[PDB]
Amino acid sequence: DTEFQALVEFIEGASYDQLISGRRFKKVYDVLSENDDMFIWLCHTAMSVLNPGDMRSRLIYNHLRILAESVASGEMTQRTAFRFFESAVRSPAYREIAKRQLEGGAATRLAGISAAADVMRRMGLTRRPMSSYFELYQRIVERSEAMTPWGFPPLFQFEERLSLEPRLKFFSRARIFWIPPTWNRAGRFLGPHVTLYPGMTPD
RNA sequence: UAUAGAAAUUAAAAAGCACCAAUUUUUAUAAUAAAAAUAACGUGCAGUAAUUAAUAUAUUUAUAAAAAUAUAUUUUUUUUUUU
């Protein structure tokens, strides 16, 4: 266990220098957040809103299950996996299945994320054998991907462009977005090398 | 540029009257070319007041590398508009 070892090193350091410094907390924030359970929970909460009887949803379910198992094995990197996930999410078949599950009313997504937590426990997709149920509780009681009505985190990178155009007011109407260098006075440290994002301010 | 942390962001190319010998000009009256002069091209101290929107066309003034007048186009940073 490297996380308990880093916690032991944090306790020994905080007892040594008798203050809460910036180095040790950054070290244990980097150790406790090395897990890829976020993307596995993304794929499994996308699998939860599907239909176990429809063959198209069976194809999407097996595709996202293979994607999550390839992420947990370390054979596929995170960026290409995110490309695969956003290509599977932006398809109109998955969005139509999510709309049908919204129009149902007695939706099976709660049993979906519960079986997802059981699968992540059984297949070893977590760091601790009982951490998936606390992560399920965290997905339920907080604003997350599980409370979204379509089953993905609500960023504009996971929503279609033809729905992005009439809603949002971006730079010019009728990829990586940048500030053009005509703005010589944008902010204090803002410039052309500072990227901007459509639906969020990451600053 | 800001009702002065412009201690910020900045290469997405804004350009080629005198000075420098591709050349050019003048003349011989009953005598008929060898004498003189001028290079071609682009700058040019022209500024400041924390001065000063820019570009294009036309006209007038010897601050002419300047300045003024008459139109057109562009520049707005989101609290006005949306086939």
* CA gap A34, A102 in Å, rounded: 34
**Beta pairing partners, A195:** A178
How is residue A150 annotated by DSSP? S
A188 Cβ contacts chain B strand, under 7 Å? yes
DSSP structural state of residue A184:
S
Is the CB atom of residue A149 positioned under 7 angstroms from any atom of strand B? no
**Cα angle for residues A5, A69, A138 (degrees, 5° grid):** 60
Six-digit token string for A149 = 């009505």
The b-or-e profile of A139-177 (16+ CB within 10 A means b, else e) is beeeebbbeeebbbbeebebbeeeeeeeeeeeeeeeeee
The alpha carbon of A193 is separated from its chain's Cα centroid by a whole number of angstroms, namely 26
Question: Cα separation of A41 and A134, whole Å?
Answer: 12
Chain B bases near protein CB atoms (7 A cut-off): 1, 5-6, 8-12, 77-78, 82-83
User: CB-based contacts of A185: which residues, under 8 Å, 6+ apart?
Assistant: none
Do A10 and A27 meet the contact criterion of CB atoms below 8 Å apart? yes
Contacts of A145 (CB under 8 A, 6+ apart): A41, A42, A45, A139, A151, A152, A153
> Could you say which DSSP state residue A145 is in?
S
Within 8 A by CB and 6+ apart from A156, the residues are A164, A168, A198, A199, A200
Give the residue before each break in chain A, using a C-to-N cut-off of over 2.5 angstroms; say none if it is continuous.
174
A193 nearest nucleotide via C1' and CA: B9
Q: Are A73 and A67 in contact (CB under 8 A)?
A: no
Question: Which resolution in angstroms does this entry have?
Answer: 3.1
- Report residue A2 as tokens: 């490297």
Q: Which amino acid is at A153?
A: P
Q: How many CB atoms are closer than 10 A to CB A126? A: 21
Separation of alpha carbons A160 and A95, rounded Å: 10
